[PDB]
Amino acid sequence: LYNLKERYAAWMIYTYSGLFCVTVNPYKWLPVYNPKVVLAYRGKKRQEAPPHIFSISDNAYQFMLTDRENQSILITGESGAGKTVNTKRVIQYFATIAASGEKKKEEQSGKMQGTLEDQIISANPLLEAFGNAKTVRNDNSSRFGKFIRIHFGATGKLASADIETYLLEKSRVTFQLPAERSYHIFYQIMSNKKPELIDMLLITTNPYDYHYVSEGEITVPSIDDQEELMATDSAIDILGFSADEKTAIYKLTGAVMHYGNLKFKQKQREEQAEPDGTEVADKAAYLMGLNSAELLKALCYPRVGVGNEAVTKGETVSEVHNSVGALAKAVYEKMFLWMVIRINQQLDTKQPRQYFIGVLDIAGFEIFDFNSFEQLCINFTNEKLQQFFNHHMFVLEQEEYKKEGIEWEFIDFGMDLAACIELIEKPMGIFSILEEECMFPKATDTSFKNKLYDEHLGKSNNFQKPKPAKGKAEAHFSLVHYAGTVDYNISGWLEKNKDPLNETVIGLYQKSSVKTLALLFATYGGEAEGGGGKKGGKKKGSSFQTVSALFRENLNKLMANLRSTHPHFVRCIIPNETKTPGAMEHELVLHQLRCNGVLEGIRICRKGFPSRVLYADFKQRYRVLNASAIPEGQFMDSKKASE
Amino acid sequence: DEDETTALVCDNGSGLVKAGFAGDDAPRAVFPSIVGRPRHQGVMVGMGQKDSYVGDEAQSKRGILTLKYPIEHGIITNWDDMEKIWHHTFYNELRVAPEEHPTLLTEAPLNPKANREKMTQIMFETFNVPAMYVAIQAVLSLYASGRTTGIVLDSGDGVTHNVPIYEGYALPHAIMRLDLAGRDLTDYLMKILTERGYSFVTTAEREIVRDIKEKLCYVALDFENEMATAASSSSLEKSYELPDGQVITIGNERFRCPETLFQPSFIGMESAGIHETTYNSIMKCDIDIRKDLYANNVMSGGTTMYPGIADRMQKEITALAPSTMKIKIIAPPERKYSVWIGGSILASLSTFQQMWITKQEYDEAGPSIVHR
Amino acid sequence: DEDETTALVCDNGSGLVKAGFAGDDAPRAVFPSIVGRPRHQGVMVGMGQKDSYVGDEAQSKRGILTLKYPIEHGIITNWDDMEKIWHHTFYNELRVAPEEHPTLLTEAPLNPKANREKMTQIMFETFNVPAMYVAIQAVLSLYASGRTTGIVLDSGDGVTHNVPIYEGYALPHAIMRLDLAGRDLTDYLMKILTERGYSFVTTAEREIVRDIKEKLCYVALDFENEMATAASSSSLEKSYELPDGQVITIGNERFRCPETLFQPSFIGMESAGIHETTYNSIMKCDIDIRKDLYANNVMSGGTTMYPGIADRMQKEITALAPSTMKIKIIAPPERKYSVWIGGSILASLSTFQQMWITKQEYDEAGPSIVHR
């Protein structure tokens, strides 16, 4: 704690802790990202230069060409740690130090749509408008995870990229805490820099007209919604999107606002929902390439298919408002997914690819007094990532003792975590019990709960019944993750995990005049064959059976990509909740350290032979001791030297 | 996805096989449960000598083959001929290779322990599937209607059953089987329609009596004053046009056929009927669970599709049940595939993965493993 | 407040546990005193494997578990299963952590010295409560009716007792125990009601005979010319509607059931009855204290709630007691919780603080300390 702290009060944000590259939020500006530095760190082992991210980032590259292996960089930290910033910054780094489109390099609309190095870059600012928002911690917080594959060529020059998105905060779209706000886009658009848009979408410039997006805050001083709107705009173009699509995006993003304005009322003497007007529906309908009526019907009189037919079901006021919200979110998401794909599509070149460098940006194990479903998914991700490291280290360590000739035997450090992982991902584990019950037409959260216990309680060690008191809000089940005990609340899971959507409506989308909208829904339309009658399995036709069924699939496809990689680690840190440069709350940093892996890397180090010096890092600092004979050694063989 | 896409669901019936991928909404494959064996030596033009025929090619070519039904009354009676229907299902109908697909199969209500072990022996040892699972049919039907306690009246082509289920466990001692179903029902219509002064003489006349039964048959409520209605001769009559012009009329018999399900006496059966049997199952169960079963009479099976079956059953058991009780007859529209859909749901489910019997379990525990 | 809020009162019975916070007017938690152990391996949907069930989940799921009663006739007979009911009480029912709450418990009339030491051993050593205290049940009932000398007829689910108390000290040699209570009484009604020509066949028929006993049963005064009245057949009859319509009628038996408490001969018991036993307790006590006991017959317990119990007892002992005596049968309305309420009062009291056995007393004196 103390080392970090001291070199921070001195304004040094980069300090290493083994393999890690700790990074602390300056909260102010620094000449570090300096265009001089970039070069400086170019072609240098981390022992030839001071702690910095470009060190990691260059070495990767090096290593990439030297060993002929693919690489990775894992950036991770809490909401306010400032990872995007790094991630982005790493990315620029790659683009710079190994570009050369030759023709694209000239000062003629440089970096505009029409080159990648730019596309690559331009990517961000689009995603950010849609997947970023003002959090109470950050002003531009990443509300989703991501993985880019920079596909380097044979020579060593840029060839392709690849994005993938994980866990998007769908809730912002409909909600927002009091000090927060929704995605930027909304506020961007209503900013009025492109007035047509306002009339085009049929909205106003006052957000308080759109409940969905003004539950929290509307304006942020550090952000210029007007400037961004263009940034965004321009990015779309560069990204190669069709105007139409670029039109769908917009039009589609406004429909969603409108939905939240959709109002209903109880039919008299009936408990049914009946439309409270065709003012808004009209707009939503038009904007989506729909028919007002058909739309309001489907919404109100959802026509289902229980048995072997299609049974028309009536809904309540409360049921509608909620379904609407479900589509709003559903639509936004999908779209977001699409955009990514489309991006990827442009980022696809024909040129050969020999290796890639993966840059992973996701959240780290965060513990809250309230841990719900989303927490499990993330924690699980991290507990995996951790084991991923612990192993790499075990492998790594063991090489030294082999190189040197020491006689040290030890078991994989990952192993310690396998217990927790199996409990989650294995067959009779949490997810399964979670995803099975989702098949029971009449199951309860409570039901699920019991199934969870009857099977794991008393029989499983990592499994425990909660500690209901302290800063926690209710009881259901705790798990014993590497970072500690997490108290999980199971309420909504079943639902959240089912992704219930009014299929009648989706129908309409599926046959929209707005192709794009139509597209986004296709994959739902193609699995319906499979879940034709009441009860059963959605997967028969390609429909998701679990909220969690993919997450896993994606998380596997990932951790696999992570393996055929030479892992490079970066841990981002957040000094003080109060936003003050040169300061640090203790216990706050302490926390991160445990959940980071930093404290676990120190542990494993200390088992034993604590301090472990990297050879160059060893030369430089100590050559001077027998100056003649130690310098010769270090220079003559980077390793043999220290020897 | 490995197996999210990959789980197969095969529902083996007395008349039809229903098959497809867990995930889908309805069976990808539906076909007769026959295996035809050619009575003479010879060939079709362009084909080779075929030793055997299955499903629709056995039905279509029935005049030169001896047709055989592997499943008598829901139970597999011939294992040589069943392995033939499975082979056809995987390789020709779904066109998948079985050795990379988990397979959820179904069995009947009081299916002998030894059979559940034998189809496991054949699934793992002759088809080499990665993993499999056998669900009980009424239990998948219930579950496909969302719930876990209820009583299923299940009725298909060779058997009818009542399977009371409580929090998922089908109750062995309360299950009733009535061997009169849609097969019996097509042959009775046949006679009341020849008896109306007709002739189903060629095989193109025989087959379509079954399509008359499906399209035009009804279960009237107050079957009493429906015969009475028949006589005053209302516009209750219904004429069907045959393969050719020969417009046949069916007024009345239209409902005399499903009245067989409430009155087995119409066909020289001395057994009790569907509604009484629903009830008797119920007064054979624990006392405290009888309000549950009564409010959850789930219907499944091709023969329970006759319109107005539910209303007749509704009133049939209200009037036998103590008035303090709530009666509730659930009959969904997709009911001819309830069983299958319940399997599709269950097998595509997030929590089912840990009940799949894997070749690891089998090679190590013997057929006993899946038998439970 | 530290413990003003914080004192717990747990009354352990043969049929029910009554629990809650000292201060409250009535028990926060009331539930059966059972511990169910599953007869088979399996799960409920969404739950894990459960080794054990307690209270109402054991009653509701009784068909798949072997039910066991830890307290036989008011005495704790199985200590593994009792620690299970306590655990359930603190952690699930009252949802408190026990290690910061003083706990007032109750025991039975001639509870073996060794038991009072054992539940103290388990309270302090496995639940780690700060302090605890064991009150005798009749003694809390008396005190909850304001007084300190009287005789309590206490009658619940497995035992009946008479505990003469003088200025707070229950009189060991005058206490009488009669093992016939509300449990015995529900099973006798059962037979006189099947004997009325009925059937409590399913478990939903069994359970409700007990709700008939509670709602419709009476203790008639002059039970003699009440049978005589039954015969002339007045509008004395009373029909109850079952879980369903099945309106059952109970005219007469309605009071033949509590006449069992005065005549044990109705059930093949040779012991004396409630009123004689009240009396015998009394002619076993000192002479000078007998006018006090007679004017203070306090009743407590679920089975003493039958209307007209007090009038019958009033006249039952007047006519056995010397005429120079004043008889007085106090039967309060909250009597099914007298015991508990007496504990709530006492433990929330200003002067009780100095009788709490603290872990300091225990870790220093051994279980002997609280045993007195």
Swiss-Prot record, chain A:
Signal peptide as annotated in the record: none
Localization, UniProt: Cytoplasm, Myofibril
Region entry Actin-binding, spans: 555-577
Residue numbers bearing the N6,N6,N6-trimethyllysine modification: K28, K449
Residue positions binding ATP: G77, E78, S79, G80, A81, G82, K83, T84
Location of the Myosin motor domain: 1-643
Domain notes: The rodlike tail sequence is highly repetitive, showing cycles of a 28-residue repeat pattern composed of 4 heptapeptides, characteristic for alpha-helical coiled coils. Limited proteolysis of myosin heavy chain produces 1 light meromyosin (LMM) and 1 heavy meromyosin (HMM). HMM can be further cleaved into 2 globular subfragments (S1) and 1 rod-shaped subfragment (S2).
Function: Muscle contraction. Myosin is a protein that binds to F-actin and has ATPase activity that is activated by F-actin.
Subunit structure: Muscle myosin is a hexameric protein that consists of 2 heavy chain subunits (MHC), 2 alkali light chain subunits (MLC) and 2 regulatory light chain subunits (MLC-2).
Family membership noted in the UniProt record: Belongs to the TRAFAC class myosin-kinesin ATPase superfamily. Myosin family.
Designated name of the protein: Myosin heavy chain, skeletal muscle, adult
Organism: Gallus gallus
Curated annotation (Swiss-Prot), chains B, C:
Sites bearing N6-malonyllysine, chain numbering: K61
Keyword annotations of the record: Acetylation, ADP-ribosylation, ATP-binding, Cytoplasm, Cytoskeleton, Hydrolase, Methylation, Muscle protein, Nucleotide-binding, Oxidation
N6-methyllysine sites (modified residues): K84
Assembly information from the UniProt record: Polymerization of globular actin (G-actin) leads to a structural filament (F-actin) in the form of a two-stranded helix. Each actin can bind to 4 others. Interacts with alpha-actinin. Identified in a complex composed of ACTA1, COBL, GSN and TMSB4X. Interacts with TTID. Interacts (via its C-terminus) with USP25.
Organism per entry: Oryctolagus cuniculus (Rabbit)
Residue ranges of the region described as Interaction with alpha-actinin: 110-123, 358-370
Enzyme class: hydrolase
Cellular localization per UniProt: Cytoplasm, Cytoskeleton
Protein family membership: Belongs to the actin family.
Further remark: In vertebrates 3 main groups of actin isoforms, alpha, beta and gamma have been identified. The alpha actins are found in muscle tissues and are a major constituent of the contractile apparatus. The beta and gamma actins coexist in most cell types as components of the cytoskeleton and as mediators of internal cell motility.
Record EC number: 3.6.4.-
Protein name, UniProt field: Actin, alpha skeletal muscle
Chain positions with Tele-methylhistidine modification: H73
Gene3D superfamilies: 3.30.420.40, Actin, Chain A, domain 4
Methionine (R)-sulfoxide: residues carrying this PTM: M44, M47
Keyword Ribonucleoprotein carried by entry: no
Pfam families attached to this UniProt entry: Actin (PF00022)
One GO MF term attached to the UniProt entry: calcium-dependent protein binding
Modifications after synthesis and translation: Oxidation of Met-44 and Met-47 by MICALs (MICAL1, MICAL2 or MICAL3) to form methionine sulfoxide promotes actin filament depolymerization. MICAL1 and MICAL2 produce the (R)-S-oxide form. The (R)-S-oxide form is reverted by MSRB1 and MSRB2, which promotes actin repolymerization.
SUPFAM superfamilies on file: Actin-like ATPase domain
Reaction(s) the record says it catalyses: ATP + H2O = ADP + phosphate + H(+)
Gene name of the encoded protein: ACTA1
GO cellular component: actin filament; actin filament bundle; cell body; cytoplasm; filamentous actin; filopodium; lamellipodium; skeletal muscle myofibril
GO BP, sorted A to Z: actin filament bundle assembly; actin filament polymerization; mesenchyme migration; positive regulation of gene expression; skeletal muscle fiber development; skeletal muscle thin filament assembly
Modified residues (ADP-ribosylarginine): R177
Function of the molecule: Actins are highly conserved proteins that are involved in various types of cell motility and are ubiquitously expressed in all eukaryotic cells.
Residues found modified as N-acetylaspartate: D1
